[PDB]
Amino acid sequence: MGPHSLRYFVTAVSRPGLGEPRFIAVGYVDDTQFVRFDSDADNPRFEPRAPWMEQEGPEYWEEQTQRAKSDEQWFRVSLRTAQRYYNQSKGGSHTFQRMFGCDVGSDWRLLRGYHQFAYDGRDYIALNEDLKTWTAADTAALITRRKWEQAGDAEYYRAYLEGECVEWLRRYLELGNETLLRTDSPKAHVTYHPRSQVDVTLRCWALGFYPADITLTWQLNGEDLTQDMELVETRPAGDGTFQKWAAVVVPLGKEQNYTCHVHHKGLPEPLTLRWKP
Amino acid sequence: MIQRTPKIQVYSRHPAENGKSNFLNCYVSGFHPSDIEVDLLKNGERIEKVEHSDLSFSKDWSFYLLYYTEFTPTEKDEYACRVNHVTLSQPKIVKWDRDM
Amino acid sequence: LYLVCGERGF
């Protein structure tokens, strides 16, 4: 059920003295990468990055490669144009990024359509949530905004985001359903780590879970310790699942009073765990 | 050019068990620009088998990559991740601690 | 389905 998303993350980087920019495009469905294009491959093609994408036929791969190549040329031109326009007279490597795609609700409505750009890591121009107007960050982006209004780009991307974007998301969810529609519950446990005469560290682990969204919280007999804890970012295990941990420093000899609570799509109710010496 | 320094985690795919085959990961995230040097080290020396994920980025535009290799944890061998990036004065080495 | 910005702007 639930929300789903189709997102493409596109990066172009200029490379003084090396010729053409590095151009990389990557597609995700929810938290799972499924395609890529990379200009540095010796035969650059749009290609599958999940075994279930091998079900798409040659026409899909050809069409998508042609679109990737056309975009690659457009980023190259834009990088050259920006460098003129911002008066980057010392030259150097610069970055254009594009994010686009669709978030859909559990009822398949389009929650948000994205078509959005950054230059050297900063917002440049973005299609607003109305899919009609643009947010520009500075005067260069005002200039591109005028051109894009003139060309009707917002209307073109709105038609794609409300139509093809959603239709292809559905299709990919069907093709990859064994993997994309699964939910892998976290396997959790607590470890214990000496620190000093007066205290120790309890670390709560959540391993092997999908999707990535998760909450880990320590408590002391009901009392929420969220703010006293050390919490790492959720991280990929490399096999399609994710990991996370949260630790708390507690007085030597009171370990038993602390409980870790785990919330995840796969857990009908929160898991409660303690140090098990 | 904005500059964001990478966050780095080094960890195993599975719970470490000595003499049991596993995967060593170095996840680098939150960085900009994308240019970054990552090596996995065994006792200070570069591992050559290392693979990595396709460059991608988050909602704030900051990049992330996963570097990984097959390995076999042991009592005596020290593993680590070495990272270099324009935001660092010199490369940063983060040691693998099986409890993190 | 990737879609191209194919001869637009700045």
Author numbering:
A (entry chain A): 0 to 276
B (entry chain B): 0 to 99
C (entry chain C): 1 to 10
Authors' text:
We show that insulin reactivity by a CD8+ T-cell clone, known to induce type 1 diabetes, is characterized by weak T-cell antigen receptor binding to a relatively unstable peptide-MHC. H-2Kd is unusual compared with the binding motif for most other mouse alleles (that have an anchor at position 5 and the C terminus) in that it anchors at positions 2 and the C terminus, reminiscent of most human peptide-MHC binding motifs.
H-2Kd·G9G crystallized in space group P1, and H-2Kd·G9V crystallized in two distinct space groups, P1 and P1 21 1 (only the P1 data set is shown here in detail), which showed identical features (data not shown). H-2Kd·G9GF crystallized in space group P 21 21 21 with three copies in the asymmetric unit (omit maps and density plots are shown in Fig. 4). For G9GF, clear electron density was only observed for peptide residues 1–4, indicating flexibility in the rest of the peptide. However, in the more dominant conformation observed in the other two copies in the asymmetric unit (G9GF-stretched), the C terminus of the MHC α1 helix flexed by 1.8 Å, allowing Phe-10 to slide further down into the opening of the groove. Additionally, MHC residue Tyr-84 side chain underwent a large movement of 8.2 Å to swing out of the way of Phe-10, compared with its position in the G9GF-bulged, G9G, and G9V structures. Tyr-84 made three vdWs and one HB with the peptide in the G9G structure but in that position would cause a steric clash with Phe-10 in the G9GF structure. Thus, the dynamic movement by Tyr-84 in the G9GF-stretched structure might allow Phe-10 to be accommodated by the MHC F-pocket rather than forming a more prominent central bulge, observed in most other MHCI structures with longer (>9 residues) peptides.
